Amino acid sequence: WDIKTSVGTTAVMVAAARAAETDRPDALIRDPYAKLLVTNTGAGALWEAMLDPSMVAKVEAIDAEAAAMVEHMRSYQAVRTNFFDTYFNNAVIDGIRQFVILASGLDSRAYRLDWPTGTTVYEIDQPKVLAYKSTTLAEHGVTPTADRREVPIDLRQDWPPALRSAGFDPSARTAWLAEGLLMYLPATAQDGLFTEIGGLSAVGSRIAVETSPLHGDEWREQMQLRFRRVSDALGFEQAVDVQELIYHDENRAVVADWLNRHGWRATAQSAPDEMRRVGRWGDGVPMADDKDAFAEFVTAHRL
Template identity: 45%
Template structure:
């Protein structure tokens, strides 16, 4: 969802006040509030960054989502908000680069997974992910998308209104990941005896360390031999950075309230202890592997992010 505590400070003005409450175990959100609203900010970054002729990834559906949200989101894409932070040469360029790089990483991961024969894809906290609609899926692939009902409803309504159809057997699983999502997933036809490709993008920082481990435990239990998982993970913000954000007069403090900025198990090591093999790469290193150079003066913050792929023996 984001790679820095600056995100909320850069949300359109009509969204900022909606992020003000502290996270609780029972908090709720939709596409315009709380954690859900960050998906629109990220979709806007994908839409804007994907316009470049040399963009490492493109997501034409991102523009549909942002336009459907209306208001200042639609104004941004139409060029009516020239001073928007996503258009700045420092933060905006860096944030767009982050989103396009991780999009490319996970797109390539899924292409490799289905080439290996996997036919079950599970996207946790799917948000405004459009891969079921835009990747060239072979026959027999089922894509399960898990998220809150209101988020999935917004996506379905937007794409249906635009006449878009998924290119795989897409199955929505309307569930809060803090609940019994494994049972809900099985109820939609998921077969734990078959290998699965899991996708965990922009999620972990919004879970407590304990909830992250519970999610990993469930994923491990549901994964047959040959399954794989791709994960975006972020190290905690340094204490002084987090404290400065919390005391900031801007809305940067609100983003800190949405995350759990605590030490947590590193994903590659966690899965290795349970018989998975894997590798990780830092976001700046991956950007360079794509033939680009990290932009702006914020590479240190980008270096907090790793992209991980693990495979179950």
Template identity: 35%
Template sequence: MADGVPESLAGVGTTAIGVALIRARETDRDDRLYEDPYAQAFVDVAEREFLDPGSPEHAATWATVRQLVDAFYEARTIGVRITDDLLQDAVAAGCRQVVDLGAGLDTHAFRLDWPHPVHLFEVDLPAMFAFKEPVLRELGAVARCARSTVPADLREDWSGALPGLGFRETVPTAWEAAVLGFLARADAQRLVTVLTELSAPGSRLTCPQMSAAAVADTVRSVRGVERVRDAATPAERGLGPDAPKWLRALGWRTEVRDFGELARSYGRPQPDGVDAGVIVATLG
């Protein structure tokens, strides 16, 4: 973990804290695209740790996280709403399990209505849940569907724990996989190969398809960004530009939705410098 991050938050991705900041900011808007009543609490706890008196270095990192949030807010906040809608579409289409890969500090199980019985699994690194769960407990948050946490590294054996938690391979699953963009190409491909083996026909997979160069340009535009080591997404990450073709070879039917059109459908302008789409894949 970067030196500029307090020991108490080591292992909690600063990008996850950044997205919590984005959800808190959106929740405050009158014209909000979604409401996350838990996001501000995560931000408050993280901010206290960063601004703990005596560490100018941690305070500088926090300032950089805020600048990254400014740089990515417009695009990322629309991304949150897109994911919410795609997960709910998948459930409406018959998926009864949702797996949020790299769930971070998102609270889909708590903040969305699930009109059908759903079991939602959150997978992230153990340090993330060590931070997240006490905050949710303190808030008295109650999940609106069955919820299981899976503390695991997605580059290793993350799926072994699923059956014991009630995951069934015969039930169509909605996979939220934005985390692919944070994984090296080989790890991202291995992850999708494994989740495909766990997917019944009718399962859905959603992940953004974005230009690594555009993301890198935005990251570079933020002063002091080298303090936030997990912010960068180098070119050889994720499934890459051939993702739809690669997914089709595994049996997924793919559709790529244009990010700008989706943004406009929510009444928001297309964010500057975003060259992206959203892959929606259905198995079988």
């Protein structure tokens, strides 16, 4: 692969999760391109084997608790993807034609969703990662289903100027997306992010965001010990590496509250409520009754 960053590993682990849901007869979501994106890394073999539905029983024989986290991730990623897909579909139906995916990673929406002509989808993320995604797909004969414009820059760097020279039109309504991002930014970087987003946002722009959970790093500690127990058990040569939330005990604005104080109307749907509505929630997970252990999904329109 030769992408060895943390965005790299996480990108692979969540794509692995989507691929595993995808091959199922009643998939909650289907990403035809996850499996390919993972394979061509070389570094996902392990996630593939752990998350494969046909392995449920071998995994369970190892540890019933890790068994439940493996399940929880499969379900979580499916439900997350489902939610944001729905959000992107509603923007479309309500007439929105400009779309920015932040830290786009190996997200493949620009290629798999159905977009009306005249739609533009800007992808912002790291040079290498974007190159990797588009070369791979390009080569397997996969073409965007929208006018996909790469903005190759680090999210913690000066990205507004490069979004604009990619053609972004700050006066069209925009549907912004930030999945798998906030837990990993320091808190001021969060405020800076929404400030920069607000400034580029025309009346009626929407934003969807996964938020960082208060107790999110306790739960990271568990994925680690569990997932390590499982690949040790599975004979996988190479140590699991779950991205740490290093800024976890920095003082963080509550995201809806913050948007509502800055020109948006926002709502939070907590991940557990969302997983419950679609029937994918296990009371048998660890930290089940730590509401604060899980992200919220936050939606807002620009006033």
